[PDB]
């Protein structure tokens, strides 16, 4: 059951077929499937305690000893140092859910682990793993269409942001930043609404700068309809505030020009030397005069400048920033309405951006300064500035806000919304059970198993919330059947009601559909594996 082939010959002569056949291993058949299922079950049972509002976090430590506290399944499984190839498949599964959706990264893993755990029982009874995979595909199609059936729709306009704030709060219910729950949800909504081609088009996250600075309180996290930069004004005697700032964005270093081609300017006389000297002087003066003549009150270069240029900027009352990065230059241009200029000669009053406030901000006893550009007219860019007492909660807040933004993005892509708290999973399990009562006997064990696996998310939520899994799940299932109401789920917060439509617990239809589809497809590819030849 291991060690590749071992016979060596029925004639006594050496039998070498594969390189290092003696050092290599292999698992064949049902034992391989059982190993896969145990690996997946271990990963899923690790993750299931980080599910729901009452879900707990995991503290990941990397190779170099940095700590990451998180509830995000994708971050956990990415930081997790796995050596089992089936656990790697689960890491890839969660990564896929995060890529496509940005939420559900823990639901996919828990659900896939449950599907494989139930296939384990089905294989024991002797069913072909492919028949199990096909029954799972059938039930997954049934559950997907049933989600389309029980789904709801929300308004994605900028005038009624309550359905979106409710969705974002549902997303952020399970994260440490629920201490500023609504404060966080609001800004995620506003962010995606500020930066979006709202004709059901895409949302480019490059337009959302998520910056964090230790210090302050989580309550200080805010949305800046503009940009924040980690720089300050180039000269220490420049002013730290500029109101009604006309901004010149420049990618030309404030230095004498220099050709890119190999060049040698030859000085052959004192007259040449004096001409060179005055050429340098006049270049500096001409640059500053062109910046003044365009009407700018502020300059922003990407490539830094020198002593003469800095002092001339100060003398001419032109506050200036240097060494700004390409992405930040782009964001400043997009936000202030300005155009990026490659040389001073090409600078005009129309290419300038406008920001109603440019400020230099301090952070206590640090010596660190930041530059805020805001009060723009119609900034199509935005920044989320996060504060906090430690780098762990700052990084967790960053990823939590990424989840919230991704949820609002998914709403802009499809406004349809299913209700969570395990209610959608219970309803889909009921639908799969109903359709299983109709299919022939043999693909019925696999559809019943798919239903029993879908029912693991409500069980996990109740368990994490201290409730008794079986009791709570059976009660809400019975209520769902009796009073037709696919919004009945687990009262994780113990608000009394089991109706998630009243508690404003909201999930995205694309989110649940993607969870189901990804879990089923990966479970299928795993049941289809029956041999491992690891070295």
């Amino acid at each position, epitope marked *: 059951a291991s060690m590749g082939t071992l016979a060596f010959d029925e004639y006594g002569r050496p039998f070498l077929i594969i390189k290092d056949q003696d050092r290599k291993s292999r698992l064949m058949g049902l034992e391989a499937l059982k190993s896969h299922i145990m690996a997946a079950k271990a990963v899923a049972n690790t993750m299931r305690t980080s599910l729901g509002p009452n879900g707990l976090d995991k503290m990941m430590v990397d190779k170099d000893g940095d700590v990451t506290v998180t509830n995000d399944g994708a971050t956990i499984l990415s930081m997790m140092d796995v050596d089992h190839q089936i656990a790697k498949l689960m890491v890839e599964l969660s990564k896929s859910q995060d890529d496509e959706i940005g939420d559900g990264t823990t639901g996919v893993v828990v659900l896939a682990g449950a599907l494989l755990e139930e296939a384990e029982q089905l294989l024991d009874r002797g069913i072909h793993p492919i028949r199990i995979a096909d029954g799972y595909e059938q039930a997954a199609r049934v559950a997907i269409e049933h989600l389309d*059936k*029980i789904s709801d729709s929300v308004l994605v306009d900028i005038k009624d942001t309550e359905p979106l704030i409710q969705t974002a709060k549902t997303t952020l219910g399970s994260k440490v930043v629920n201490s500023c729950h609504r404060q966080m949800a609001e800004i995620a909504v506003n962010a995606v609404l500020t930066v979006a081609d709202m004709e059901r088009r895409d949302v480019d996250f490059e337009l959302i700068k998520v910056e964090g600075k230790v210090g302050g309180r989580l309550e200080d996290t805010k949305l800046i309809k503009g940009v924040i930069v980690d720089k300050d004004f180039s000269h220490p005697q420049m002013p730290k505030k500029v109101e009604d700032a006309k901004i010149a964005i420049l990618t030309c270093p404030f230095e004498p020009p220099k050709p890119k081609t190999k060049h040698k300017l030859d000085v052959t006389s004192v007259e040449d030397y004096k001409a060179l000297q005055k050429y340098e002087k006049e270049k500096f003066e001409e640059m500053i005069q062109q910046i003044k003549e365009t009407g700018a009150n502020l300059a922003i270069c990407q490539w830094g400048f020198d002593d003469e240029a800095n002092h001339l900027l100060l003398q001419n009352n032109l506050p200036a920033v240097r060494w700004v990065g390409g992405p930040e230059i782009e964001l400043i241009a997009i936000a202030t309405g300005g155009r990026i200029v490659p040389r001073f000669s090409e600078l005009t009053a129309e290419k300038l951006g406008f920001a109603g406030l440019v400020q230099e901000i301090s952070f206590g006893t640090t010596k660190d300064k930041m530059l805020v550009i805001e009060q723009c007219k119609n900034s199509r860019a935005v920044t989320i500035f996060i504060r906090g007492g430690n780098k762990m909660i700052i990084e967790e807040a960053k990823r939590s806000l990424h989840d919230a933004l991704c949820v609002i993005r998914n709403l802009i892509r499809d406004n349809r919304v299913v209700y969570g708290g395990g209610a959608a999973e219970i309803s889909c399990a009921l639908a799969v059970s109903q359709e299983a009562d109709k299919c022939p006997t043999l693909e019925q064990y696999a559809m019943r198993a798919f239903a029993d696996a879908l029912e693991v998310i409500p069980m996990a939520l109740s368990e994490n919330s201290g409730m008794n899994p079986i009791q709570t799940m059976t009660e809400v299932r019975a209520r769902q059947v009796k009073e037709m109401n*696919p919004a009945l789920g687990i009262d994780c917060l113990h608000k009394g009601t089991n109706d998630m*439509k009243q508690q404003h617990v909201i999930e995205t239809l694309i989110g649940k559909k993607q969870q189901i589809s990804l879990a089923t497809q990966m479970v299928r590819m795993i049941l289809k594996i029956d041999d491992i030849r690891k070295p």
Partner: nanobody
């Protein structure tokens, strides 16, 4: 999506009594409310009465107390037994069904049944 059938007709003034049924089929998961409406020629459609899933029925003002609207949830159908018929009760009877959370795009109307008359 929601296919609605209505069985009615047969006006009678000899004492006056009729019963009109309305049955729903198709794609849905819940019929939150079922209502009977009236539309005459040159008149505005009104609500005879309406019943909820819990059986709770609200009647109208110009006619009330003689209503026997009953809802079979086992087949998601409704039956209106109306008595004391009169010439102004002679109109088109429409059925209404709110489904799947009860949003404004969830009201489904029938084709309406016009109540015949002899000569």
């Amino acid at each position: 999506q929601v296919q609605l059938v209505e069985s009615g007709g047969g006006l009678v003034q000899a004492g006056g009594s009729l019963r009109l049924s309305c049955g729903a089929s198709g794609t849905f998961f819940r019929i939150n409310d079922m209502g009977w409406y009236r539309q005459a020629s040159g008149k505005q459609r009104e609500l005879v009465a309406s019943i909820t899933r819990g059986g709770t029925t609200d009647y109208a003002d110009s006619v009330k107390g003689r209503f026997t609207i009953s809802r079979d949830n086992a087949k998601n159908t409704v039956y209106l037994q109306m008595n004391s018929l009169k010439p102004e009760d002679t109109a088109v009877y429409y059925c209404k069904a709110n489904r799947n959370w009860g949003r404004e795009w969830d009201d489904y109307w029938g084709q309406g049944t016009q109540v015949t008359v002899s000569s």
